[PDB]
Design a protein around this motif. Sequence first.
Motif, PDB file in Angstrom:
ATOM      1  N   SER A  71      75.466 -25.396  50.096  1.00  0.00           N
ATOM      2  CA  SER A  71      75.378 -25.934  51.453  1.00  0.00           C
ATOM      3  C   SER A  71      76.232 -27.184  51.635  1.00  0.00           C
ATOM      4  CB  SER A  71      73.919 -26.234  51.801  1.00  0.00           C
ATOM      5  OG  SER A  71      73.373 -27.193  50.913  1.00  0.00           O
ATOM      6  N   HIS A  72      76.217 -28.090  50.657  1.00  0.00           N
ATOM      7  CA  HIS A  72      77.019 -29.307  50.719  1.00  0.00           C
ATOM      8  C   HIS A  72      78.097 -29.345  49.643  1.00  0.00           C
ATOM      9  CE1 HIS A  72      72.704 -30.561  51.795  1.00  0.00           C
ATOM     10  NE2 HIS A  72      73.309 -30.293  52.938  1.00  0.00           N
ATOM     11  N   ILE A  73      78.514 -28.189  49.134  1.00  0.00           N
ATOM     12  CA  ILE A  73      79.366 -28.107  47.954  1.00  0.00           C
ATOM     13  C   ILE A  73      80.663 -27.405  48.326  1.00  0.00           C
ATOM     14  CG2 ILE A  73      79.308 -27.720  45.473  1.00  0.00           C
ATOM     15  CD1 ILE A  73      76.903 -29.201  46.539  1.00  0.00           C
ATOM     16  N   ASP A  74      81.786 -28.046  48.016  1.00  0.00           N
ATOM     17  CA  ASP A  74      83.104 -27.487  48.278  1.00  0.00           C
ATOM     18  C   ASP A  74      84.127 -28.281  47.479  1.00  0.00           C
ATOM     19  OD1 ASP A  74      82.652 -29.710  50.207  1.00  0.00           O
ATOM     20  OD2 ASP A  74      84.699 -29.217  50.831  1.00  0.00           O
ATOM     21  N   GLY A  75      85.269 -27.649  47.220  1.00  0.00           N
ATOM     22  CA  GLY A  75      86.301 -28.254  46.400  1.00  0.00           C
ATOM     23  C   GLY A  75      86.816 -27.336  45.308  1.00  0.00           C
ATOM     24  N   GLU A  76      86.866 -27.826  44.066  1.00  0.00           N
ATOM     25  CA  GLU A  76      87.389 -27.021  42.965  1.00  0.00           C
ATOM     26  C   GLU A  76      86.467 -25.849  42.631  1.00  0.00           C
ATOM     27  OE1 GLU A  76      90.091 -27.024  41.128  1.00  0.00           O
ATOM     28  OE2 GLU A  76      89.547 -25.958  39.286  1.00  0.00           O
ATOM     29  N   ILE A  77      85.153 -26.092  42.554  1.00  0.00           N
ATOM     30  CA  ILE A  77      84.233 -24.972  42.358  1.00  0.00           C
ATOM     31  C   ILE A  77      84.323 -24.001  43.524  1.00  0.00           C
ATOM     32  CG2 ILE A  77      81.810 -24.268  42.153  1.00  0.00           C
ATOM     33  CD1 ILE A  77      81.306 -26.893  40.667  1.00  0.00           C
ATOM     34  N   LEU A  78      84.490 -24.517  44.741  1.00  0.00           N
ATOM     35  CA  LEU A  78      84.663 -23.623  45.880  1.00  0.00           C
ATOM     36  C   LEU A  78      85.920 -22.776  45.737  1.00  0.00           C
ATOM     37  CD1 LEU A  78      83.622 -22.853  48.805  1.00  0.00           C
ATOM     38  CD2 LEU A  78      85.365 -24.472  49.589  1.00  0.00           C
ATOM     39  N   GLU A  79      87.007 -23.354  45.221  1.00  0.00           N
ATOM     40  CA  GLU A  79      88.235 -22.587  45.025  1.00  0.00           C
ATOM     41  C   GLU A  79      88.042 -21.523  43.950  1.00  0.00           C
ATOM     42  OE1 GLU A  79      91.438 -22.090  46.265  1.00  0.00           O
ATOM     43  OE2 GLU A  79      91.197 -20.571  44.700  1.00  0.00           O
ATOM     44  N   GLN A  80      87.402 -21.894  42.838  1.00  0.00           N
ATOM     45  CA  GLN A  80      87.092 -20.916  41.799  1.00  0.00           C
ATOM     46  C   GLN A  80      86.218 -19.794  42.346  1.00  0.00           C
ATOM     47  OE1 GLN A  80      85.299 -23.007  38.539  1.00  0.00           O
ATOM     48  NE2 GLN A  80      87.161 -24.134  37.985  1.00  0.00           N
ATOM     49  N   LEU A  81      85.248 -20.142  43.190  1.00  0.00           N
ATOM     50  CA  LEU A  81      84.324 -19.158  43.732  1.00  0.00           C
ATOM     51  C   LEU A  81      84.989 -18.257  44.764  1.00  0.00           C
ATOM     52  CD1 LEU A  81      80.889 -21.019  44.045  1.00  0.00           C
ATOM     53  CD2 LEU A  81      81.655 -19.332  42.369  1.00  0.00           C
ATOM     54  N   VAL A  82      85.924 -18.779  45.558  1.00  0.00           N
ATOM     55  CA  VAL A  82      86.627 -17.915  46.501  1.00  0.00           C
ATOM     56  C   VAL A  82      87.636 -17.032  45.775  1.00  0.00           C
ATOM     57  CG1 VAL A  82      86.240 -19.539  48.381  1.00  0.00           C
ATOM     58  CG2 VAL A  82      88.398 -19.617  47.108  1.00  0.00           C
ATOM     59  N   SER A  83      88.219 -17.517  44.676  1.00  0.00           N
ATOM     60  CA  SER A  83      89.022 -16.638  43.829  1.00  0.00           C
ATOM     61  C   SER A  83      88.165 -15.522  43.245  1.00  0.00           C
ATOM     62  CB  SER A  83      89.681 -17.446  42.714  1.00  0.00           C
ATOM     63  OG  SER A  83      88.718 -17.895  41.776  1.00  0.00           O
ATOM     64  N   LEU A  84      86.963 -15.869  42.785  1.00  0.00           N
ATOM     65  CA  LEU A  84      86.027 -14.867  42.291  1.00  0.00           C
ATOM     66  C   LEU A  84      85.625 -13.896  43.393  1.00  0.00           C
ATOM     67  CD1 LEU A  84      84.211 -13.816  40.015  1.00  0.00           C
ATOM     68  CD2 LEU A  84      82.642 -15.654  40.565  1.00  0.00           C
ATOM     69  N   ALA A  85      85.498 -14.386  44.626  1.00  0.00           N
ATOM     70  CA  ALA A  85      85.163 -13.521  45.753  1.00  0.00           C
ATOM     71  C   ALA A  85      86.318 -12.591  46.106  1.00  0.00           C
ATOM     72  CB  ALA A  85      84.764 -14.365  46.963  1.00  0.00           C
ATOM     73  N   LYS A  86      87.556 -13.076  45.989  1.00  0.00           N
ATOM     74  CA  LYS A  86      88.708 -12.198  46.161  1.00  0.00           C
ATOM     75  C   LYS A  86      88.716 -11.104  45.105  1.00  0.00           C
ATOM     76  CE  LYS A  86      92.675 -14.271  47.093  1.00  0.00           C
ATOM     77  NZ  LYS A  86      92.963 -13.791  48.473  1.00  0.00           N
ATOM     78  N   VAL A  87      88.433 -11.464  43.851  1.00  0.00           N
ATOM     79  CA  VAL A  87      88.295 -10.451  42.807  1.00  0.00           C
ATOM     80  C   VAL A  87      87.165  -9.485  43.148  1.00  0.00           C
ATOM     81  CG1 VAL A  87      87.796 -10.067  40.381  1.00  0.00           C
ATOM     82  CG2 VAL A  87      89.281 -11.957  41.055  1.00  0.00           C
ATOM     83  N   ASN A  88      86.057 -10.015  43.667  1.00  0.00           N
ATOM     84  CA  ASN A  88      84.897  -9.196  43.991  1.00  0.00           C
ATOM     85  C   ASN A  88      85.222  -8.181  45.078  1.00  0.00           C
ATOM     86  OD1 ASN A  88      82.262  -8.511  45.448  1.00  0.00           O
ATOM     87  ND2 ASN A  88      81.478  -9.642  43.674  1.00  0.00           N
ATOM     88  N   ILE A  89      85.927  -8.606  46.127  1.00  0.00           N
ATOM     89  CA  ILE A  89      86.284  -7.678  47.197  1.00  0.00           C
ATOM     90  C   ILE A  89      87.341  -6.686  46.717  1.00  0.00           C
ATOM     91  CG2 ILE A  89      88.021  -9.196  48.244  1.00  0.00           C
ATOM     92  CD1 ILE A  89      85.661  -6.587  49.861  1.00  0.00           C
ATOM     93  N   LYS A  90      88.256  -7.125  45.845  1.00  0.00           N
ATOM     94  CA  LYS A  90      89.242  -6.203  45.289  1.00  0.00           C
ATOM     95  C   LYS A  90      88.574  -5.100  44.477  1.00  0.00           C
ATOM     96  CE  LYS A  90      92.603  -9.935  45.127  1.00  0.00           C
ATOM     97  NZ  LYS A  90      93.096 -11.047  44.268  1.00  0.00           N
ATOM     98  N   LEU A  91      87.587  -5.457  43.649  1.00  0.00           N
ATOM     99  CA  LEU A  91      86.880  -4.439  42.877  1.00  0.00           C
ATOM    100  C   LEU A  91      85.914  -3.642  43.748  1.00  0.00           C
ATOM    101  CD1 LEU A  91      83.677  -5.492  42.011  1.00  0.00           C
ATOM    102  CD2 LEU A  91      85.092  -7.176  40.813  1.00  0.00           C
ATOM    103  N   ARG A  92      85.419  -4.240  44.835  1.00  0.00           N
ATOM    104  CA  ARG A  92      84.565  -3.514  45.768  1.00  0.00           C
ATOM    105  C   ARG A  92      85.342  -2.418  46.484  1.00  0.00           C
ATOM    106  NH1 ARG A  92      80.574  -6.428  50.303  1.00  0.00           N
ATOM    107  NH2 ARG A  92      79.332  -4.553  50.732  1.00  0.00           N
ATOM    108  N   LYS A  93      86.571  -2.714  46.898  1.00  0.00           N
ATOM    109  CA  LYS A  93      87.431  -1.704  47.503  1.00  0.00           C
ATOM    110  C   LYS A  93      87.853  -0.673  46.462  1.00  0.00           C
ATOM    111  CE  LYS A  93      90.069  -3.076  50.658  1.00  0.00           C
ATOM    112  NZ  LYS A  93      91.151  -3.773  51.408  1.00  0.00           N
TER     113      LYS A  93
END
Lengths: 111, 111, 97, 97
Positions: free
Chosen positions: A89-111
């Motif tokens: 909720s109040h967290i963003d930055g480097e962990i957020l970048e790692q997590l959105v990269s992980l989410a891109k991987v997640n959507i790539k494997l989901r497709k």
Amino acid sequence: LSINERITKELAEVEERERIEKQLLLEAERINEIDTLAKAHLSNHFNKEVLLAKGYTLKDIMQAQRRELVRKFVPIEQIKAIAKVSDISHIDGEILEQLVSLAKVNIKLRK
Amino acid sequence: LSINERITKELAEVEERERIEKQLLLEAERINEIDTLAKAHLSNHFNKEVLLAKGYTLKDIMQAQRRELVRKFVPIEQIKAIAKVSDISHIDGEILEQLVSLAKVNIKLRK
Amino acid sequence: VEERERIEKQLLLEAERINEIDTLAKAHLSNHFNKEVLLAKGYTLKDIMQAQRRELVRKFVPIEQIKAIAKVSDISHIDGEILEQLVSLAKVNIKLR
Amino acid sequence: VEERERIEKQLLLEAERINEIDTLAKAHLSNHFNKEVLLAKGYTLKDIMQAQRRELVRKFVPIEQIKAIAKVSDISHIDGEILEQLVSLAKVNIKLR
């Protein structure tokens, strides 16, 4: 001073301007990626237009879209492996970048 | 002052003027060589037009071109051997002349 | 006596330099230029060392660098700091070889 | 010794000017006015340079500029600051050519 001082100064100024230009291109690509992700995976209510009407900064819009994408795609079994707690909720930055990269991987494997 | 003194003074004056003439031709050939080297092996960024416009002496331009050519052609080991140091920013002179001779040999063998 | 001590220090330095030059020259150039046979032929130690250095230059340092950096094609009379530069370039050449 | 240093600086400047004049003259006018052949014919360096400058003016600078700026049609005796103006106009002409 001898001309060699400018043999480094002249090149340094040009290199600094080139790096600034590359940074501007990187920011443009980041904005494009955020727009595509918000259009593709997130609801219309999180559009930049309505968020700006509600009065949020552009960086706030980007981080909110990233946070929603992380919650939507990355499961808690990785959120607590990277951020170490479920909600961001109040967290963003480097962990957020790692997590959105992980989410891109997640959507790539989901497709 | 006798006749032989007149002869030797006149001959010395003539030889001095001839030596000055030869020095002028030598510097002429030096400028021509540096122009050719800058046009052939170095970027247009280091052109005499801009470098003169930067309020720097022509000899400084010559030595900047020489240092760039040495870094481009002569290997760092050869620089550290002949010039005894890695940095060339304070090696302008006869050692620089030897380095640019080595660079000319390097480009000749490269072709 | 410390003057003689420093003299002996310099003697050790030049002896080590001579030893290194001889050790590399024996393995690089030939056995004909060995110290014993050169002494038998009648050359002083310094003459032997400078001849070995010049042969090392003639083996490693290319003739273009000889006639450009040393300003003369013939290493027969170039001895000095220019010879030091030539042998340093020869050391670089054998290192890269 | 800085007086001699500045004298050497001026020597370098005029040498570079002679360089530029000779290099452009060789490619623009002819090989008959080469420094070697002129010296063989027996002209001093300054005479050679001024003759080359006058030929450059006669090639690039048109005769009307000669007879109005220099006030004389003949460049044979106009040498000086007027000759400097004429050669600068010749350099302009070759730049626009």
